[PDB]
Amino acid sequence: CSVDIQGNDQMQFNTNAITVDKSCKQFTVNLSHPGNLPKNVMGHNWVLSTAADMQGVVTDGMASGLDKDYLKPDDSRVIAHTKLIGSGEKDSVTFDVSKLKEGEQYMFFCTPHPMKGTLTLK
């Protein structure tokens, strides 16, 4: 009931797709950042929302800026998120798998960078 994911200096996640076993009551993502660039210039976060909500999350996050991890505080669209990390740093996030609803489309993404993928219940 976890997955390790990396974001690198070339604005790439190392996976495009996360699957969550329905046996899991909670799920944990462990984000890391191979490379050499620091947070203030190539910081990554890992953020989960519905596909429909992603654009607003990104837009409001960019408006909120670096010190708020490029996320709007208390954004109710955000199901789960990590903090922003620079190279060598790590953050994990855990969420309640019962927040994932039947028939909904979930996406994960970094807010400052064009990096995204799908999250699916197995």
Report in angstroms how near the CB of residue 5 gets to Cu ion at its nearest: 11
Report the alpha-carbon distance of residue 116 to residue 121 in Å, rounded.
17
How crowded is residue 49: how many other Cβ atoms within 10 Å of its Cβ?
Answer: 23
Q: With CB under 5 A as the rule, give the number of residues binding Cu ion.
A: 3
**Comparing C-alpha atoms, which of 32, 52, 27, 33 is closest to residue 120?**
27
- Is 107 within any annotated ligand binding site? no
Position 81 contacts Cu ion (CB under 5 A): no
Report the alpha-carbon distance of residue 96 to residue 72 in Å, rounded.
21
Report in angstroms how near the CB of residue 23 gets to Cu ion at its nearest: 31
- In this chain, which stretch among 23-31, 70-78, 88-96, 105-113 interacts with Cu ion, using CB under 5 A? 105-113
Report in angstroms how near the CB of residue 111 gets to Cu ion at its nearest: 7
Position 113 contacts Cu ion (CB under 5 A): yes
User: Smaller CB distance to Cu ion: residue 10 or 94?
Assistant: 10
Return the residue of 13, 31, 32, 44 that touches Cu ion, per CB under 5 A: 44
Report the alpha-carbon distance of residue 110 to residue 44 in Å, rounded.
6
Report the alpha-carbon distance of residue 32 to residue 101 in Å, rounded.
27
Binding site for Cu ion (CB under 5 A): 44, 110, 113
